[PDB]
Design an enzyme around this catalytic site. Structure first.
Site: not given
Ligand SMILES: [Cl-]
Lengths: 294, 294
Positions: A35, A104, A225-226, A250
């Site tokens: 994020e 984490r 779809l790349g 991202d």
């Protein structure tokens, strides 16, 4: 008051000279977090972004805040808690994707829950970006992601959902699929990769993925779809957008959210995402570089 | 079969590559940390057969610690690498001159050790046990094991060394610290205090006093370290002072005095070895060879 808000975890990334991690003598600091990478993208494009999360008061945590603050991100809702710990992670050097080792479990951000939400503040934002990472982090965060999207929908605020898959974080694939698709029930914009869509929906076509998210109640579905670009299915209608020659997800999310908020059309927003998607897989652009490319 | 066994936690030490505060670092170097292990590395470099007992994760840091400890010649057969538990680590900054450690060791694999961890036959197979104030200060389960570790080695008429290190952060009240460290003193043949620590522990202000405090609790030897002033020793054969040389140093000191006594040298030549290594460490624990120069 604020364009976009995200909830998630940031970690310090120690990047190794190659070989196994145990053999490396030196590490460089970077910043990591799904994020927060979208946060940085939107901030660099001049949008007002707030990030909510938790961190220890230790040096790692102090570094994360600084790095985030310096990108232009409101961090007022990053509770720093000296009783808890920040997460971090190691990556080695790749010569031929380096495998990432994570640290984490039990971090401060995994302790987040519904009590960590500041309602009035959430609502002061135009848009909530949401991902399948934060809800995956722990048993408390999944409810917190639910309430976040719910709260924001009922206020008539934009909710964006990128159904990221991290199988490491969920108990069983079945559990992940049920949690992801149930969260997709609470979003206006759903941003699925084609391979994740096949997995979550069993549909073998972009149109099939999209109808699936429309049927669960979503005004807009953009399927990535790349190389072939992206496909989109919205209230205005449907189509494909070509994409670029040649991380990319991202950047693609930074693209559409930022364009849809700047008031742009849905094909134009998809183009932006294709552009930042392609562009960052080389590095998240400022407005300066955006405007320069056309 | 083995000259010396110790119990204790090693951690990975991340050292900032430039003098700033920690959050502003950009690179780190890899080293080892941990009081018992530093002593173990020196004794092993001096030629002694040393076995270390500990827990570590099977994360990359754990695997580093196991391998750096073994490349020193230390018997690591009793290091449990438990995949369910985490390896400790620390950060040090560089000092331009004037440094502070940030420790990340809560809830680590090593903190989980207790009496159940001790392998009795194995312990008894070494001539000598060296113990510290750290291991017992680590968690509520380590104190029992320190206490029992010593008890065992005495009743079998093996040799036990105690170095009363003070780490207050590790202890609940300062007073308990005093009670516990001093109760452990009840179980050593050789007690290795520093004047400062001794003043805190015993209330005495002259070495002759600190020493007689631990003689009375039943030690065969006390060697009180005095800084550049050298040391005072108080043992069954008699008392004395050793000059000490000119210019981390506690650890050198004990490697010096422990190895000499086990090597068959008398107390006064042992303290000077202790003292040479201590002063060397202030300036890097010596090989037998570097030692044989002088
Ligand atoms: Cl230590």
């Amino acid at each position: 008051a604020l364009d976009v808000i995200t909830f998630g975890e940031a970690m310090m990334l120690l990047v190794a000279r190659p070989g196994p991690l145990e053999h490396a003598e030196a590490f460089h600091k970077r910043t990591a977090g799904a994020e927060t990478n979208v946060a940085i993208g939107l901030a660099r494009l001049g949008l007002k972004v707030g990030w909510a999360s938790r961190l220890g008061t230790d040096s790692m945590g102090r570094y994360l805040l600084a790095a985030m603050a310096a990108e232009g991100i409101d961090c007022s809702h990053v509770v720093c808690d000296a009783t808890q710990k920040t997460g971090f992670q190691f990556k080695g050097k790749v010569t031929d994707d380096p495998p990432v080792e994570y640290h984490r479990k039990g971090s401060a951000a995994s302790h987040m829950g519904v009590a960590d939400i500041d309602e009035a503040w959430l609502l002061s934002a135009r848009h909530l970006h949401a991902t399948g990472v934060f809800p995956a982090i722990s048993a408390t965060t999944l409810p917190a992601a639910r309430k976040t999207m719910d709260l924001m929908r009922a206020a008539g605020r934009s909710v964006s959902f990128d159904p990221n898959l991290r199988p490491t974080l969920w108990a069983t694939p079945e559990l992940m699929r049920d949690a992801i698709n149930d969260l997709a029930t609470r979003a206006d914009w759903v941003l699925p990769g084609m391979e994740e869509g096949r997995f979550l929906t069993g549909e073998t076509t972009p149109e099939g993925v999209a109808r699936f998210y429309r049927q669960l109640g979503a005004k807009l579905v953009v399927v990535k779809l790349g190389a072939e670009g992206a496909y989109f299915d919205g209230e205005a209608g449907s189509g494909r957008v070509a994409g670029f020659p040649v991380g990319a997800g991202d950047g693609f999310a930074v693209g559409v959210i930022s364009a849809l908020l700047d008031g742009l059309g849905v094909p134009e927003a998809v183009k932006r995402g294709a552009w930042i998607g392609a562009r960052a897989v080389q590095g998240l652009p400022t407005r300066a570089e955006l405007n320069a490319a056309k």
